Symmetry: C2
Subunit: 553 residues, 2 copies
């Protein structure tokens, strides 16, 4: 049937994460910059990631020596990948031995070249190795479409019950000038440094850097396991251009067959589709072909006009390549979650080679509410098309006193988390405090350095985090390093009347005591904290990895 997306993480130009991403999208920010010479001398535009050299090897039991040898593409994805699980509320313990498939979009070995265990195959495998997953682990280079092709394959394997969970994602970095030479020599890029999407000034695209992940499961299982659900995937498909005028030329016929075959197969009526995140690289001849192809397929089922919005996040962040599909799928899910459409940039004059007026589609350039008729759930398409000629298209449909614990592998980070949660609670005025504390309990691995506290208000919660921060609270915050406190807890770990006493406090909602013990290292069955009403797992910020610098040895 359908495929629930139950977790996400992302890192794009000018977004450290999915949140910042969505803030930027709403404020129609353009993240393209000039290429500094820290990267390379231009003696010129790129959507860039900051601090690409940064990694927390120790967290992943990697020797810092080996980290210099790792493609940063591997390292960054390893991080976002991990965090995506944490977003969904999953941790290593829960993930151990899962039939979780990993499908990793990736199309460059630049860093391995500059070297004068870096296979794609290994890149994919890092995460299963780390968290002991058992689904297949596969890297997809279909160039531009890589992350959406992986999404399709993940969809198929879930449906066909070969796996029970999937992690899909993509990652692209542009580390060497050689890569741009390749693309400039082949007349692909814009001299303006812009993906002028749908515009009649469409020059070419501007390279983007990126890394993104999605956790996927079968919708049945997701509702059952009470995960939170960003959206669902109701149809996907892939195919080829075939013989086109040059290997990297697109094929309108392939786009139409693809799009048509999908809707037909999955009983989707183009009228139901209100937005479409286009491939839309801002490319001279590409743009109008994509447009016409889609428009036409829509027109085969419906006379209705100007009802489907269109947009491309490449206008915002450039061409994020292997990561393109996943960044687009994320855009859409976020628009859905906020019932809000947002601007596609760089559009003044419609492409001359397509007349919009009589089209089912319209460019949407305004921040506005995403309205739906009836009680009919929103639906949108994401497209991605490779310069190799392998295309992918999917259709998403919208879905429909507490005890706060944190931990980390090092004290420095535990603070950083704390700072993360504070900024998160600060910025989210309406948080369900039970939900949050439930997530921190059951949806995060209990690491060696801990802290905990009680609160029954957003206010009291924040002033707990503040207190912890410069450590000056009235007094009601517990904090321990687990390895110094083994003997303060052996009792509860072994004596059967002690075990029974704890289960009495837990059972008697005596949280100050439970919090004491938990920080010291005691394993707490968090379920005994809840009788009739159990809360829900939610999206919270994920592990704030050490920002340690690794590059060539």
């Amino acid at each position: 049937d359908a495929i629930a997306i139950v977790g996400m993480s992302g890192r794009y130009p000018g977004a450290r994460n999915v949140r910042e991403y969505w803030d930027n999208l709403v404020h129609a920010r353009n993240a393209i910059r000039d290429i500094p010479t820290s990267r390379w001398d231009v003696d010129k535009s790129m959507g860039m990631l900051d601090d690409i050299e940064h990694f927390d090897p120790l967290f992943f039991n990697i020797p810092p020596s080996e980290a210099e040898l790792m493609d940063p593409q591997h390292r960054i994805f390893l991080q976002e990948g991990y965090k995506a699980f944490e977003d969904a509320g999953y941790n290593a313990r829960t993930l151990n031995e899962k039939k979780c498939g990993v499908y990793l979009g990736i199309m460059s070995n630049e860093y391995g070249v500059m070297l004068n265990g870096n296979s794609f195959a290994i890149a994919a495998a890092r995460i299963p190795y780390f968290l002991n997953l058992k689904g297949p682990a596969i890297p997809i280079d279909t160039a531009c479409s890589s992350s959406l092709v992986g999404t399709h394959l993940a969809r198929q394997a879930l449906i066909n019950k070969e796996i029970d969970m999937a992690l899909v994602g993509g990652v692209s970095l542009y580390l060497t000038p050689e890569s741009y030479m390749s693309m400039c020599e082949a007349g692909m890029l814009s001299p303006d440094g812009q993906c002028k999407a749908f515009d009649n000034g469409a020059n070419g695209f501007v390279p983007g850097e990126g890394a993104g992940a999605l956790v996927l499961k079968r919708l049945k299982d997701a509702e059952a396991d009470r995960d939170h659900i960003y959206g669902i995937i109701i149809g996907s498909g892939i195919n080829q251009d075939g013989k086109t005028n040059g290997i990297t030329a697109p094929s309108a016929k392939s786009q139409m067959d693809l799009e048509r075959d999908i809707y037909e197969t999955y009983g989707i009526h183009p009228e139901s589709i209100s937005y479409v995140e286009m491939h839309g690289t801002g490319t001279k001849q590409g743009d109008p072909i994509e447009l016409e192809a889609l428009s036409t397929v829509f027109q085969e089922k419906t006379d209705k006009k100007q009802f489907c919005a269109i947009g491309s996040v490449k206008s915002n962040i450039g061409h994020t390549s292997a990561a393109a599909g996943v960044a687009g799928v994320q855009k859409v899910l976020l628009c859905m979650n906020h019932k809000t459409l947002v601007p596609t940039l760089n559009f003044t004059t419609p492409n001359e080679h397509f007349e919009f007026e009589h089209s089912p589609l319209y460019v949407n350039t305004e921040l506005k509410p995403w309205e739906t008729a009836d009680g009919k759930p929103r639906r949108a398409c994401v497209s991605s098309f490779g310069y190799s000629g392998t295309n992918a298209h999917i259709v998403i449909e919208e879905y429909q006193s507490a005890l706060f614990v944190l931990s980390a592998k090092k004290e420095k980070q535990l603070k950083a988390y704390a700072e993360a949660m504070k900024d998160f609670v600060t910025s989210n005025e309406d948080i369900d405090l039970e939900d949050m504390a439930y997530t921190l309990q059951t949806g995060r691995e209990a690491m060696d350095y801990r802290m905990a506290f009680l609160a029954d208000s957003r206010e009291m919660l924040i002033k707990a985090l503040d207190d912890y921060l410069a450590e000056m609270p009235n007094g009601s915050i517990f904090a321990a390093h687990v390895k110094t406190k083994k003997s303060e807890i052996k009792l509860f770990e072994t004596d059967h009347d002690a075990k029974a006493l704890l289960q009495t406090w837990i059972e008697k909602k005596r949280l100050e005591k439970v919090a004491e013990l938990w920080v010291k290292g005691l394993q707490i069955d968090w379920n005994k904290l809840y009788g009739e009403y159990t809360p829900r797992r939610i999206s919270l910020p994920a592990y704030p990895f050490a920002e340690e610098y690794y590059w060539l040895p």
Copy 2:
């Protein structure tokens, strides 16, 4: 349901093709050589592997055939170029040509794990490697390159299986390709303690050192069994079950996991109702590796033992003993071995085996090493079955189960250049020479309907293997006074316009065709006339068969 394999092509160390492969396998030949310095100076780096299973002439390509500018060919990874060739030929093996293939939902799944050649340079993505063939023949299935390292070609096989079953594609081309062009690659593997100092994959042996690198390129055409019987293709075997998974956390990323192997193998049989007793051979991963071998063995053995007390009934073997570790191409070379054994009802030796691995006791096992050329016997009327295993150093494993499948003429040839047409003729001669029992109708039917009619043609009649061979000889020596027809199509447009346009002429041809006047049809065909070969057959139509495929120009391309 099941998945028919309907075409194959292959190029491995000491086999220019699938036929040579099978000759070697039967004569238990070892193709490992010392690495000459045409490749690279082993002496310059050697210190305590100087062995490699190699392909010859890796620099050779026929760009013009694929409408590629010879300039661009120097820029192509030879891995791309070789696969592009074997890939094409695999289609031709099955009896398919461009015309027939145009616009097919045909998926391509290409195993590939190295960009060595792109590194020495300074349109060489994996993504493009895969895409070459769909671009060339206008296929519309997705085109996807798989790097799961060792297991790449078998993983692609699984994904192709799934897409066919799920009716997302109607045909699939799976394959793999590995070359070892630089010493840097061996340094990587030697430094990580992977290779044998002996230059051998001593498979299952207690002297198991490590593996020896292999080079290779292989393809399989796959379709849904229903469609294959319907379209009357020839069928090497069928795939009745496949699966993939991960090691997970093992002692080091590249260590294997017996638990993953067992779950994989067990889950497959369980899902597809396969009883280990039914399995008479298993082409193992069997890289000849110190700790890998016994784990693989135990894992399989155990799973077999969970369903059956029976003993010494399953043969095992690894073609890496014969040809080395062909890497991305490993799975496809193994699948091909098996299909050939099936076709000949013949098992063959796995090499380099004197003493069983100490860490596994065979005696009480369902399995046995088979070292002898012998008949592959089956009980009842029960079709043979075998497994192929492949396990990546990345940790993504794949395992499939194949089951055996139980079911005056006018000879035309053409090519894009005269030189090659002759080569083709030499190929067919050697093929007919070597196959005493060929059905001559089948063959001529295949040449008619299963090969694209290219610009340089020749044709002739024959009703005997003898007369057929003499024809080819005559054509080759240039002598018949004769029988044979032969034309370059572009010089002969006006000799045929008549039959192309006048409706009573068209009708006259259809009178000769219809009246089995073959000398006349052959005349016209060589000159360029399009002949509806079906009108040649009334009640009884012949079958397409495996014949040799296009003998590509052997033109040399390397760094510019």
